[PDB]
Amino acid sequence: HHHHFNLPPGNYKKPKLLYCSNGGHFLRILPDGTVDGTRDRSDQHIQLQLSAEENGEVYIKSTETGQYLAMDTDGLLYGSQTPNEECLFLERLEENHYNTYISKKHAEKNWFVGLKKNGSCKRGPRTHYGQKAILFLPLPV
Q1: Which of 30, 57, 100, 127 could crosslink 34 through cysteines, CB 3.0-4.6 Å?
Q2: List the disulfide bonds.
Q3: DSSP 112
Q4: Residue 99, annotated as binding a ligand
């Protein structure tokens, strides 16, 4: 492994909102495949269903559109119509409280799912351990 194995509590039985404290935005996967964040809790594209693959690995899927969260070869998040290697994330506990999501494909490069204070997604190479941008809290829908 390139990363620790402290896993967050909870489960995948119900869909969740992934709340980022950095700017206070919910992760959103828009119908056109765009990914960003919004503070509007009524948004229909922030409901996400997570599911497990191997222990500690997850797929993050839009319940409204069916799209899978994914990070491309240049570190940009996008919504994928089908599940592929870029859609698997390593879900870990961070700072003994939050959830972080590391791109499995680019795990050796420490590329995380992260949102900036202005609600725009961070590009893989611009994320790293220690940032507030990579910290999420799963909330009920």
Answers
A1: 30
A2: none
A3: B
A4: no
**Among 85, 23, 89, 105, CA closest to 56:** 89
Torsion (CA) 133, 113, 14, 10 in degrees, nearest 10: -70
Q: Where are the domains of the chain?
A: 1-141
Burial group, residue 95, by CB count within 10 angstroms (0-12, 13-18, 19+)? exposed
Type of residue numbered 132: K
Method: X-ray
Question: What are 84-87's contacts with CB under 8 Å, separation 24+?
Answer: 87/59, 87/60
Beta strands in the chain (DSSP E): 16-20, 25-29, 35-38, 48-52, 57-62, 68-71, 77-80, 89-94, 98-103, 136-140
Q: In Å, what resolution does this model reach?
A: 1.8
Token pair for 44: 């229909």
Torsion angles phi and psi, residue 48, rounded to 5: -120, 135
- 34, 4 Cβ separation under 8 angstroms: no
Residue pair 27/38 in contact by the 8 Å Cβ criterion: no
Alpha-carbon distance 84 to 25, whole Å?
26
